[PDB]
Design a protein around this ligand. Structure first.
Ligand SMILES: O=C1Cc2cc(Nc3ncnc(Cl)c3Cl)ccc2N1
Ligand SMILES: O=C1Cc2cc(Nc3ncnc(Cl)c3Cl)ccc2N1
Ligand SMILES: [Cl-]
Ligand SMILES: [Cl-]
Lengths: 4, 124, 124, 4
C-alpha cells in the first residue's frame, strides 16, 4: 500500500 | 482525496480476468477470425481496443454473441493481441511483427502500433 | 518466453472498466445492500473478491441479475470497497475503518483486511 | 515497454  | 493505493491491484485483477478467460468463465462473445474462434469478455476487449469499444457501445452490436473480423486479419496476430489484452505481455517476433502491427492498427491499439513501428524502424 | 511488457496496461484496463461502470455499460448485476443498489460487472467483482468468485462460479447463481448481501453489511463500506475494486484506491478513514474491515472480511478481500488491521493496531 |  502507498500514498498515490 | 486522502485514499491509499494497493500497487499490485490492477495487475492482480488482470491476472484473474485471464484465469476466467482460460476456464471459459462468463465469456460473452466469440471473435471469428477466418477459420479460427476466440472466446473473450466484451468488457476486456472494449477496455483494450478502440475498435471493440466502438462495436460494443453500438445499440445493436452490443447484443451480438459472435463478431466476425475482416478476412485480411491474421488469426495468429489476433491471438497474440488477445493474449496481450489479458496479460500486458506482447509476443513480438521477426516472423509475426507485420501481422501483429496490421492487426493492432485494425483493432486500434495505439501503444502496440507504436512499439511495432519502433521495432521495424530499428531493423531498417 | 521472449515477450515485451507494457507497464501501464493493467492500470489502463482498470481505468476503462471503471469508465464503463460509471456510464453503466455492460454491467450485468445489481448488488443490493439493504436499501442501496450498486451496478457492476460480475467479472470485476469475481477478480477482486473471494465471495463474488464463489457466487458467480456457482451453476445457479452465475445467472442471477440481483445479489442480496447480508443485512449486517453497511452500504457505505460496500461503496468504498466497490470503488477500490475498480480503481486500486481505498478511501480509509477513522469514521469508516470498522465498516470497511467488516465488509472486506465478508467479501474475502484479504489485502484490504490486512491494511485495516495494521491501521487499527497503530491507533491502539 | 520493458523486458519483464
Ligand atoms: O489504443 C486504444 C485503446 C483503447 C481503448 C478504448 N476504451 C475505452 N476508452 C474510453 N472509455 C472507455 Cl469506457 C473505454 Cl472501454 C478506446 C480507445 C482505445 N484506443
Ligand atoms: O482476497 C482475495 C481476492 C480474491 C479474488 C478471487 N478471484 C479469483 N481467484 C482465482 N481465479 C480466478 Cl478466475 C478468480 Cl476471478 C478469489 C479469491 C480472492 N481472495
Ligand atoms: Cl495498446
Ligand atoms: Cl484486496
Amino acid at each position: 500500500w502507498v500514498i498515490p | 482525496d486522502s485514499c491509499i493505493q494497493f500497487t499490485r491491484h490492477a495487475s492482480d485483477v488482470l491476472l484473474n480476468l485471464n484465469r476466467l478467460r482460460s476456464r471459459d468463465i462468463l465469456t460473452d462473445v466469440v471473435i471469428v477470425v477466418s477459420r479460427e474462434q476466440f472466446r473473450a469478455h466484451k468488457t476486456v476487449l472494449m477496455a483494450c481496443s478502440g475498435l471493440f469499444y466502438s462495436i460494443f457501445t453500438d445499440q445493436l452490436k452490443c447484443n451480438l454473441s459472435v463478431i466476425n473480423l475482416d478476412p485480411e486479419i491474421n488469426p495468429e496476430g489476433f491471438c497474440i493481441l488477445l493474449d496481450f489484452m489479458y496479460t500486458s505481455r506482447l509476443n513480438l517476433r521477426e516472423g509475426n511483427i507485420m501481422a501483429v502491427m496490421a492487426t493492432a492498427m485494425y483493432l486500434q491499439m495505439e501503444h502496440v502500433v507504436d512499439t511495432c513501428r519502433k521495432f521495424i524502424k530499428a531493423s531498417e
